[PDB]
C-alpha cells in the first residue's frame, strides 16, 4: 500500500525542460541517479524474458508513489517485444501504455538496437525510423541504442529518428576486454573517450557505458568514469551485469568517480546474470555526498513483491548457482550465458561446458577481437559449439586444406550484415567462410531500399480482414510471422494479458476461482 | 483357433488414451504380455493411428534411433551432413548425407519410439 | 585439552571469537593457542554500522578499542568477522585504517556476500591496507557464502597489492568444487540471490537458510518477511547484541514465538502477559553466553528468569575442573577399547555423538572412503563402485542382487567383491 | 606371472565368449563399452568394466564403433585395471599389428598372434610366397568354389595342430550365413591334404595362438588353393569345438601362458589324439529382414525365448525381451549351432531349434536361415559359393496367418469402443452361467 | 561351449505355482575331464539371472565346490551330513564397508531419501 498523489519526477522535468538541456540537469545533479532493469533485463537475464505484464502493470503505481526520485524505468525493448507476443499472447504495446498510466512521474526507458530497432534482421531506414516514430507515441522517453560492433555510423539513423521525436537519445558505448591491460591494447582508454566525443557529435543527449557482460572492473571503473566525463560534457550511465559477482563494486566505483546514473535490479530479481543488488547499492551510498535519495524500506516492499511474483516463474529458472570469474575468460553477454549454456546442452556437450567457453574465447580473437552482445555474441556462440563439435581449433578453421562449412550467422557477419569492426574482417576467415561470395563494408541498412509502407500495411490489414493501428502496424514490420499469429490468437483467446499468471500458464484446477479485469 | 490350439487370453490392463489418440490394451497370450493399439473411437479418435514411421530402408527418412521425448527441434528446410533434433532421456540426432529436409514430423516436446520417422529429405 | 589436540592435530591458524565479543571469554582459549605456539587469530564481530550516528552503541572506537585489548590480551592477527555481511565499502575504508593505527597486528577480513555487494567491501578493505582477506572459490561462493574469490582475484590482477594467484587454477579448481556441488543437491536451499533485507534483520549467513526452513517446518514460510522484522525488533528487546553462533539462534528461537504467538515486543516484557520463553533465551538471559557490555535488560531477564537469579561472572568460572583420568576410564569403557587422545577430545566436546559415531564405525567400518553418490544412495542394481580400504588396493565392488524382505524382516544384498560372490543381510527398516 | 585378469577389448556375443572361458578357468575378466553400449549385456558379464570414448582427457566423444577401434582407450583401461592380458575377440583390433605393438610398449600379452606374424600374413605378395615356398598350390577359374578353411593353433614352442576344417562356401554377397564342420563333402583323403598344407603355412609362419588357413576348393577337380590366413578367432569357431570337443579359446589362453600343446595344461592334445566326431553346424541369427531386402531391423524386443535340447549349443547372452536393437553395430541376435552324428539329423536339429525359437518386437532372418538348410542343394552339399546369389526360392516370402493377434487386436477393439450391435441394447445379467456341453 | 540346458519352461513374467514341481530348467555341463567340468557348471550357474523368486543356486554351487565333491570321496549321506553346505561366516573392514553399501542401499539415507536428487551426471574429476 503507498499516499496521497503522485509527486513530479524525471518524466516532468524531460518533459518542461526537453531532451538537451534534460540531460544537461542530469550531468548536474550531485546525487547518483538510478534505473531500476527489473521489468525489462532482469527478467530477461533470469527468467527468458518471461516477466508478464499482469506482474509487471500492477506494481507501476507502486514505484511511482513510492519512489518517485528513480531515473527511469527499463522495461521496454530487447527480448521483450518479441517473446510478449510469442510466448506470452500479449502485446507489447498495452504493457507499455499500462506502465505509463501507471508511473506518470518517470521516465519510460527501452533499450533499441541502432541498426534494427527490435528486430531480428536488418530493416529499411524508413522502417526503422518508423518503429522509432511508434515507440516514442507509445511512450517511450529515453532511448538507449546501441551497435553490436560499436560502429557509430551505423546507430545515426536511430539517434536521428530519437532526437526527431524529442526524446532522449542515450547512446550506448559497449564495454569489452580490460582498459587496465596493456597486453589487450585494442580496447584501450582512448577507444572508450574517442567514440564517446564522436557520439556526442552525433547528437546524443547521455552517453551510456554498456557492460552487457559484466567486464568492467572497479580500478578500470575509477579511470573510465573521470576520463569519460573528461571527454564530454554530456552525462553518463553505466549499465553492467553481476556474473562475476562484482559488478556492485564497479557500480561503487563508478558513483565515486562522478558517473551520472547506474543502473540495478531489485534484489529477488538481481545477481548473477542479472544486474547487481539495487537495494544493496543504494544501502551502500546512505547517508553519503551522493546519496541517491530512495527510501530502502520501500525498495524492500517491492523487491518482496518481486520476489512472490518470481516464484509463479518456476518454469523458466535456469540451473545457475552463483558467481563466475570465468565470465573474464569467455566475455559472453550476462544476456546469452543461460541460453548458449541450455543450446550447448541441446547439441550433446553439456559436459564440455567449459571446452565450449574456451572455444568463444579463441573464436573471439579469431575474428579479430570484437565487441559480442546481440547479435555478433549469438555468432560467436555458433562458432564455439562448432569448434568443440567437430574439433576443430582455430588453426584448423581458418586453413586452406580442412573444409568447413560455417554456421550461417558467421557466413552473414564476415559478409557484412552485422556492420563493420574497427578494423575491417580478417581476410582469410572471410574469405574461406564466403565460398566466393564477396563481402561489403557499407552500412548494411543502405543496400536495402525504401520499404513500401502503404502497400505492407494494405497486405497486413487483408491478411486479418480489417485495419489495424499503427502500432500493430510496426509491430508486423518488425515481426511479421510473430505479430500475424499473435493477432490472430487474440481474436480467438480476448485479452488473456488480464489472467493472473498461475490462470495464464496452467489454468483453473477444479473449485479454483480467480478474478480478471 | 483350430482344434488341438487353444489360447488362452487375458486382459491385464487398459490404458488411458494416449496422444496419438491410441488406447493400449495389455493382454497376456498363452502366458507372454501383448500390447495391443486402437483408435478410441468412442472418444472421437476416428482417423488415428497418428506418428509415422520409418523404413528401415531409405535415405530420405530421419528414424528415431531411441525412445524419449523430443527437446529441441534445429531444422525445418535443408542442409549438410548438422544436428537435426534432440531427444531427450540429450541426443544429439545427426544429419546422415547431404540434403535438402522436405518434412519433419516433429515437432517437439513430443514423446516418440525407436523407429519413429523424425523428418524426410 | 581440545586446543593442544587440535594443534597436535594440525592446525596452524585458530580463529577465535566469542558471540558477545567479550574478551574476558576468550582468554582461555588464546591463552591455550599460545600455550600451544600456533597463531591466534582473535576475531572481532561486527554489527550495526559504524558510519551511521543513529546507532553509536557499535561505532569506530567499539572496534579500534577491542583490537587494542585483545592485542594486549596476546592475539598474533585480529579477525573483524563479519558473520552476517554488514560490513559496507564507506565503512571499511575508515575502519581497516583505522584499525591499522590502533594495533600494529596484522589485520584479517572475513564476510559474507548476502547483500550481494561483499566483493566491493573485500576491494575496499584491500585499498585501506588490510592485511588478509576470505572468499569462497565461485563455484561455493556468493549470497549466504563468501564473495567470489576468483573475481575478487581478477579485481586485483596487476594491481600493487596483487595476491599472485593464477586465476586459470583458480577456475579449474571451482571447476571441481562445481562438480562436487553437484553431488549435494539434497542440501541446496530456495535462496534466489542478493538481498539488502540483510541490513534489516541482520542474520548470519550461516543462520539464514537454516532459520527459514526452521520457520517454515512451524506453519510460517508466508510470514517468513514478518519472522525477519520479529528478528530485528528481538535484537532490540535484547538490548542491541552481537549476533552470530550461538546467541543468533537465541534472536531466532524468540523472532520465531513472537511471530508464532503473534507477540509484539510489549507484549514480550509485559507484567501481564504470560510469556513462555524459549529454553535458549532464559539460558542467554541467565548469563550461560556471557555478558554484553551493557548487561542484559532487567524487565526481560526478571520476566524471562521466573524466580531463577541470573549470574555475570564467566560461564566457564562456575564449572569444576573436569577429572580427564576418569571421563577417560568412562569412555574407553563403554567402547570396551582404548580411546586415542584425538577421540578423547571428541568425547569431551560431544560425549554422545562420539559415543554413537564410535558404534557406527564399528558396525560399518571406514564408510569416509566411499564416494559421496556411493554414501548417500548406496548401489543401483549392476552398479559397480571402486573403494579403497588401504593405500594398495582397491575393490571393485558390484551390487548383482537384492532379496525380497523376509520374516525376521531382513534383505539380503548379493555382491562381486574383486571377482568373488559377497552376500550381506541388513533389515529392512520400512518393516 | 601367470595371466590372471583378462580385457577383453570387443563386445556383444565374442566378449561374451571369452568371459565364459576366462572364468572357468578361474581369470579375472575386464569389459569396455561405448556409451551406445551403456546397456549392453556384455558389460554387465565381466568382472570390472569401463567406459571407452567419453571423457574429459578426449576432445572429443567418439563415435560408437570409433570407441571400440580406439587403440588409445583400450590401452587406457587396461592400465587402470591392472590387466594381464587383453583378448582381441574378432573384428575390431583383432587384426591391427599397431595394436599387438601398443600392447607389447605396455607390457599386457596379446592374445594373439605376433605383430610380425599379422604384417606378413597380411600382404597377399608375402602370404602367396610363403605357401609357395612350402609347397602349398595357391590360385583360373574357379567358377564352382567351395570356401574351405582349416583351424590351427600354434604354441610358443614350435608345436602346431589343426583342428581340421570348415566349411564356409553359403555365403550372401560376400558374407559368411551357414557354416560346417567338418566340410561334408570331403573324403579323408582330402581331408589329411588340407590338414598337410595348413600345418606348413602354421610352421612357417611360427603362428601363435588360434588362426585359420582359408582355402579355396575347384568343385569341377577337387584341387585345393590356398588364399589367406586368419590371424584370430573367427565367428565360426564354434562348430570346430563341439565337433572336436577343444576349447579354442581356452587353448588361445594357455598358450600366451607358455603352455605347451599336448599337455594337460595347454588344453590341447597331441595331434594323434585331435578327432572328428560327428557333424556341426551354425546359423547366425541377425535383425536383417527377408522381407525388406535384409536391411537389419532395429527396436525393443519385446519377446526373446531360445530353443536348446541335446546337441544345441548358443552364443548370445545379448537378446532378451526388454533389449533395445540400435543400428550402431551389427544386428546380431544369437548364434546357433546344432550337433549331431551325421549331417542330415544336425540339420534337422537346426531346423527344430531355428523353429521353436521366439523373438517378437524386431523382425529376424529366422525364416531364411530354414530355407537355405531346408534346400535340397544344401542337404546334398552340392552348393558353391554362389549358391545364394543364384538361388531365388530361398527369398519366397512366407506369410504368417497371425490369427492370435487378430483376435487380440479385435478384442480390443470391442473392449474399448464395443460392438454397435449391442450398443444401448440390455446387457446380459452379469453373473453369468457359461453354456455347458452336457 | 559346453553347456545343455533343458528347461523350456521359465521366462520373464512366468509365474510359478504351487501345483507342480518347482523345477526352472535342468543344466548339463560337459569337458574332457571332471574338474573342467565342474568350473564350467559353476561358471553357468552364477551366470544365469533369475528375478523375482529365490533359487536354489548357492545351494549347487555350494554343493560342486566342495572338495569332497571334487575328490570324488563322497558317500549318499554327503548332503544330509556336512553343515557348511548350508551356512556362511567374515569380520573385516571389506565386510563392513559392504554391510553399510547394503544398508543404505536397501533403506536410503536418512539425509537424502526424501531431499532432492542429483541428476541421474559427471564425476567430479581431480585436475
Ligand atoms: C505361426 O504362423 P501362423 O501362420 O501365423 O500361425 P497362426 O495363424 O496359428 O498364428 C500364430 C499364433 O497363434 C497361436 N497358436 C498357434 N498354434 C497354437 C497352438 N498350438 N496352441 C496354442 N496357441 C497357438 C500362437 O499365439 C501363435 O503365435 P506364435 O507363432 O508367435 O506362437
Ligand atoms: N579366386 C577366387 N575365385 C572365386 N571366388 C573367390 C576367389 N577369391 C575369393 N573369393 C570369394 O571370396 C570369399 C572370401 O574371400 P577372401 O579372399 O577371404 O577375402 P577377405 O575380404 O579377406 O574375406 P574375409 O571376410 O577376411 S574371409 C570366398 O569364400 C569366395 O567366395
Ligand atoms: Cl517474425
Ligand atoms: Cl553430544
Ligand atoms: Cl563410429
Ligand atoms: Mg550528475
Ligand atoms: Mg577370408
Ligand atoms: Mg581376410
Ligand atoms: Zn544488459
Ligand atoms: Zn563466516
Request: proline share 5%; aromatic share 8%.
Amino acid at each position: 500500500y503507498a499516499g496521497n498523489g503522485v509527486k513530479d519526477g524525471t518524466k516532468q522535468l524531460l518533459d518542461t525542460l526537453g531532451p538537451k538541456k534534460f540531460g544537461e540537469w542530469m550531468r548536474n545533479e550531485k546525487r547518483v541517479l538510478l534505473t531500476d532493469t527489473t521489468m525489462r533485463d532482469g527478467h530477461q537475464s533470469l527468467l527468458a524474458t518471461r516477466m508478464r505484464t499482469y506482474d509487471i502493470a500492477r506494481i507501476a503505481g507502486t514505484y511511482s508513489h513510492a519512489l518517485p526520485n528513480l531515473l527511469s524505468l527499463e522495461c521496454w525493448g530487447g527480448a521483450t517485444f518479441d517473446v510478449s507476443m510469442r510466448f506470452l499472447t500479449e502485446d507489447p504495446w498495452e504493457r507499455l501504455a499500462l506502465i505509463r498510466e501507471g508511473a506518470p512521474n518517470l521516465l519510460l526507458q527501452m533499450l533499441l538496437r541502432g541498426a534494427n530497432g527490435v528486430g531480428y534482421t536488418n530493416y529499411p531506414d524508413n522502417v526503422v525510423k518508423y518503429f522509432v516514430r511508434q515507440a516514442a507515441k507509445g511512450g517511450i522517453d529515453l532511448f538507449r541504442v546501441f551497435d553490436c560492433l560499436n560502429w557509430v555510423e551505423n546507430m545515426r539513423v536511430s539517434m536521428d529518428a530519437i532526437a526527431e521525436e524529442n526524446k532522449l537519445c542515450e547512446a550506448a558505448i559497449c564495454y569489452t576486454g580490460d582498459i587496465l591491460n596493456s597486453a589487450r591494447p585494442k580496447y584501450d582508454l582512448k577507444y572508450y573517450t574517442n567514440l564517446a566525443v564522436e557520439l556526442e557529435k552525433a547528437g546524443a543527449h547521455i552517453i551510456a557505458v554498456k557492460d552487457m557482460a559484466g567486464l568492467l572492473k572497479p580500478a578500470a571503473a575509477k579511470v573510465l568514469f573521470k576520463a569519460l566525463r573528461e571527454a564530454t560534457g554530456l552525462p553518463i550511465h553505466f549499465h553492467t551485469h553481476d556474473t562475476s559477482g562484482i559488478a556492485a563494486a564497479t557500480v561503487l566505483a563508478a558513483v565515486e568517480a562522478g558517473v551520472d546514473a547506474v543502473d540495478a535490479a531489485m534484489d529477488a530479481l538481481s545477481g548473477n546474470t542479472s544486474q547487481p543488488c539495487l537495494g544493496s547499492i543504494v544501502e551502500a551510498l546512505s547517508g553519503s555526498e551522493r546519496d541517491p535519495g530512495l527510501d530502502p524500506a520501500w525498495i524492500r516492499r517491492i523487491s518482496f513483491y518481486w520476489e512472490a511474483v518470481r516464484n509463479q516463474y518456476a518454469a523458466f529458472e535456469s540451473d545457475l548457482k552463483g558467481p563466475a570469474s570465468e565470465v573474464y575468460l569467455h566475455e559472453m553477454p550476462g544476456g546469452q550465458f543461460t541460453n548458449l549454456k541450455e543450446q550447448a546442452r541441446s547439441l550433446g556437450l553439456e559436459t564440455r561446458w567449459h571446452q565450449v567457453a574456451q572455444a568463444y574465447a579463441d573464436a573471439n580473437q579469431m575474428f579479430g577481437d570484437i565487441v559480442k552482445v546481440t547479435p555478433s555474441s549469438k555468432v560467436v556462440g555458433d562458432m564455439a559449439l562448432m569448434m568443440v563439435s567437430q574439433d576443430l581449433t582455430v588453426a584448423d578453421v581458418v586453413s586452406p586444406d580442412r573444409e568447413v562449412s560455417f554456421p550461417e550467422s558467421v557466413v552473414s557477419m564476415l559478409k557484412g550484415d552485422l556492420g563493420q569492426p574497427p578494423s575491417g574482417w580478417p581476410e582469410a576467415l572471410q574469405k574461406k567462410a564466403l565460398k566466393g561470395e564477396k563481402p561489403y563494408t557499407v552500412r548494411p541498412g543502405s543496400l536495402l531500399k525504401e520499404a513500401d509502407l502503404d502497400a505492407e500495411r494494405k497486405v497486413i490489414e487483408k491478411k486479418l480482414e480489417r485495419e489495424v493501428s499503427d502500432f500493430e502496424f510496426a509491430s508486423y514490420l518488425m515481426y511479421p510471422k510473430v505479430f500475424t499469429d499473435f493477432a490472430l490468437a487474440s481474436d480467438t483467446y480476448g485479452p488473456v494479458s488480464v489472467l493472473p499468471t498461475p490462470a495464464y500458464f496452467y489454468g483453473l484446477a477444479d473449485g479454483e476461482e480467480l478474478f480478471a479485469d | 483357433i483350430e482344434k488341438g490350439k487353444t489360447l488362452v487370453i487375458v486382459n491385464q490392463a487398459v490404458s488411458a488414451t494416449d496422444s496419438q489418440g491410441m488406447v493400449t490394451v495389455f493382454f497376456e497370450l498363452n502366458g507372454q504380455p501383448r500390447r495391443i493399439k486402437v483408435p478410441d473411437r468412442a472418444h472421437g479418435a476416428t482417423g488415428a493411428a497418428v506418428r509415422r514411421k520409418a523404413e528401415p530402408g531409405n535415405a530420405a527418412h530421419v528414424g528415431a534411433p531411441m525412445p524419449g521425448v523430443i527437446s529441441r527441434v534445429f531444422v525445418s528446410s535443408g542442409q549438410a551432413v548438422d544436428v537435426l533434433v534432440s531427444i531427450e532421456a540429450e541426443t544429439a540426432i545427426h544429419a546422415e548425407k547431404d540434403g535438402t529436409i522436405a518434412e519433419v514430423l516433429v515437432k517437439a516436446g513430443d514423446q516418440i519410439d525407436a523407429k519413429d520417422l523424425l523428418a524426410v529429405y | 585439552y581440545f586446543v593442544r589436540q587440535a594443534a597436535k592435530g594440525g592446525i596452524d591458524l585458530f580463529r577465535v571469537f566469542d558471540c558477545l565479543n567479550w574478551v574476558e571469554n576468550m582468554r582461555v582459549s588464546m591463552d591455550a593457542i599460545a600455550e600451544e605456539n600456533k597463531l591466534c587469530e582473535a576475531a572481532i564481530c561486527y554489527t550495526g554500522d559504524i558510519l551511521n550516528s543513529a546507532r553509536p552503541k557499535y561505532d569506530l572506537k567499539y572496534y579500534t578499542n577491542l583490537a587494542v585489548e585483545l592485542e594486549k590480551a596476546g592475539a598474533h592477527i585480529i579477525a573483524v568477522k563479519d558473520m552476517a555481511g554488514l560490513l559496507k565499502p564507506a565503512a571499511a575504508k575508515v575502519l581497516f585504517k583505522a584499525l591499522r593505527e590502533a594495533t600494529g597486528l596484522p589485520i584479517h577480513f572475513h564476510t559474507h556476500d548476502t547483500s550481494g555487494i561483499a566483493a566491493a567491501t573485500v576491494l575496499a578493505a584491500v585499498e585501506a591496507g588490510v592485511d588478509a582477506v576470505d572468499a569462497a572459490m565461485d563455484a561455493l561462493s556468493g549470497n549466504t557464502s563468501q564473495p567470489c574469490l576468483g573475481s575478487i582475484v581478477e579485481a586485483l590482477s596487476g594491481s600493487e597489492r596483487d595476491p599472485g594467484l593464477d586465476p586459470a587454477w583458480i577456475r579449474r579448481i571451482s571447476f571441481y568444487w562445481e562438480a562436487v556441488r553437484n553431488q549435494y543437491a539434497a542440501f541446496e536451499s530456495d535462496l534466489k540471490g542478493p538481498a539488502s533485507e540483510v541490513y534489516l534483520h541482520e542474520m548470519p549467513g550461516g543462520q539464514f537458510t537454516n532459520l527459514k526452513e526452521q520457520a517454515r517446518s512451524l506453519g510460517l514460510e508466508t510470514r517468513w518477511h514478518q519472522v525477519a522484522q520479529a528478528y530485528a525488533d528481538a535484537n532490540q528487546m535484547f538490548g542491541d547484541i552481537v549476533k552470530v553462533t550461538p546467541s543468533s539462534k537465541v534472536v531466532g528461537d524468540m523472532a520465531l514465538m513472537m511471530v508464532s504467538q503473534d507477540l509484539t515486543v510489549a507484549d514480550v516484557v509485559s507484567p501481564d502477559r504470560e510469556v513462555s520463553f524459549p529454553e535458549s533465551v532464559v539460558s542467554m538471559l541467565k548469563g550461560d553466553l556471557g555478558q554484553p557490555p551493557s548487561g542484559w535488560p532487567e524487565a526481560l531477564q526478571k520476566k524471562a528468569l521466573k524466580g531463577e537469579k541470573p549470574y555475570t561472572v564467566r560461564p566457564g568460572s562456575l564449572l569444576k575442573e573436569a577429572d580427564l583420568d576418569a571421563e577417560r576410564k568412562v569412555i574407553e569403557k563403554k567402547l570396551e577399547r582404548e580411546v586415542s587422545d584425538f577421540e578423547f577430545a571428541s568425547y569431551l566436546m560431544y560425549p554422545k555423538v562420539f559415543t554413537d559415531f564410535a558404534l557406527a564405525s564399528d558396525t560399518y567400518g571406514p564408510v569416509s572412503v566411499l564416494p559421496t553418490p556411493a554414501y548417500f544412495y548406496g548401489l543401483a542394481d549392476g552398479e559397480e563402485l571402486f573403494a579403497d580400504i588401504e593405500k594398495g588396493k582397491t575393490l571393485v565392488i558390484v551390487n548383482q542382487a537384492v532379496s525380497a524382505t523376509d520374516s525376521q524382516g531382513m534383505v539380503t544384498v548379493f555382491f562381486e567383491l574383486n571377482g568373488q560372490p559377497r552376500r550381506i543381510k541388513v533389515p529392512d527398516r520400512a518393516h | 606371472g601367470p595371466i590372471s585378469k583378462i580385457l577383453v577389448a570387443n563386445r556383444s556375443e565374442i566378449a561374451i565368449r571369452v568371459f565364459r572361458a576366462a572364468n572357468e578357468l578361474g581369470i579375472k575378466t575386464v569389459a569396455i563399452w561405448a556409451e551406445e553400449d551403456k546397456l549392453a549385456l556384455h558389460r554387465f558379464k565381466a568382472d570390472e568394466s569401463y567406459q571407452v570414448g567419453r571423457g574429459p582427457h578426449l576432445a572429443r566423444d567418439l563415435g560408437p564403433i570409433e570407441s571400440y577401434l580406439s587403440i588409445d582407450e583400450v590401452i587406457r583401461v587396461a592400465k587402470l585395471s591392472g590387466a594381464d592380458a587383453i583378448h582381441p575377440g574378432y573384428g575390431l583390433l583383432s587384426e591391427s599389428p599397431e595394436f599387438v605393438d601398443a600392447c607389447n610398449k605396455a607390457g599386457i600379452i596379446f592374445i594373439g598372434p605376433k605383430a610380425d606374424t599379422m604384417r606378413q600374413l597380411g600382404n597377399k605378395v608375402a602370404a602367396r610366397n610363403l605357401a609357395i615356398s612350402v609347397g602349398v598350390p595357391v590360385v583360373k577359374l574357379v567358377e564352382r568354389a567351395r570356401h574351405v578353411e582349416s583351424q590351427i593353433l600354434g604354441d610358443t614352442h614350435g608345436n602346431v595342430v589343426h583342428l581340421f576344417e570348415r566349411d564356409c562356401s553359403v555365403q550372401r554377397r560376400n558374407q559368411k550365413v551357414v557354416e560346417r564342420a567338418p566340410a561334408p563333402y570331403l573324403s579323408e583323403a582330402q581331408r589329411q591334404e588340407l590338414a598337410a598344407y595348413s600345418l606348413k603355412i602354421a610352421g612357417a609362419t611360427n603362428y601363435i595362438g588360434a588362426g585359420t588357413v582359408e582355402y579355396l576348393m575347384d568343385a569341377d577337380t577337387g584341387k585345393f588353393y590356398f588364399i589367406e590366413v586368419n590371424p584370430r578367432i573367427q565367428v565360426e569357431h564354434t562348430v570346430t569345438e563341439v565337433v572336436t570337443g577343444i576349447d579354442i579359446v581356452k587353448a588361445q589362453i594357455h598358450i600366451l601362458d607358455g603352455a605347451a600343446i599336448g599337455t594337460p595344461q595347454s588344453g590341447v592334445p597331441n595331434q594323434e589324439d585331435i578327432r572328428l566326431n560327428g557333424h556341426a553346424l551354425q546359423c547366425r541369427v541377425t535383425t536383417e529382414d527377408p522381407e525388406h531386402n535384409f536391411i537389419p531391423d532395429y527396436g525393443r524386443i519385446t519377446a526373446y525365448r531360445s530353443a536348446s535340447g541335446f546337441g544345441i549349443r548358443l552364443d548370445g547372452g545379448t537378446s532378451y525381451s526388454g533389449a533395445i536393437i540400435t543400428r550402431y553395430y551389427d544386428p546380431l541376435l544369437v548364434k546357433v549351432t546344432a550337433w549331431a552324428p551325421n549331417p542330415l539329423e544336425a540339420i534337422s536339429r537346426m531346423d527344430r531349434a531355428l523353429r521353436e525359437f521366439r523373438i517378437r518386437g524386431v523382425a529376424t532372418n529366422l525364416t531364411f536361415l530354414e530355407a537355405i538348410i531346408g534346400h535340397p542343394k544344401f542337404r546334398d552339399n552340392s552348393y558353391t559359393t554362389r549358391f545364394i546369389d543364384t538361388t531365388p526360392e530361398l527369398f519366397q516370402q512366407v506369410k504368417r496367418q497371425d490369427r492370435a493377434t487378430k483376435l487380440l487386436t479385435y478384442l480390443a477393439d470391442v473392449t474399448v469402443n464395443g460392438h454397435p450391435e449391442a450398443k444401448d441394447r440390455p446387457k446380459p445379467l452379469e453373473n453369468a452361467a457359461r453354456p455347458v456341453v452336457p
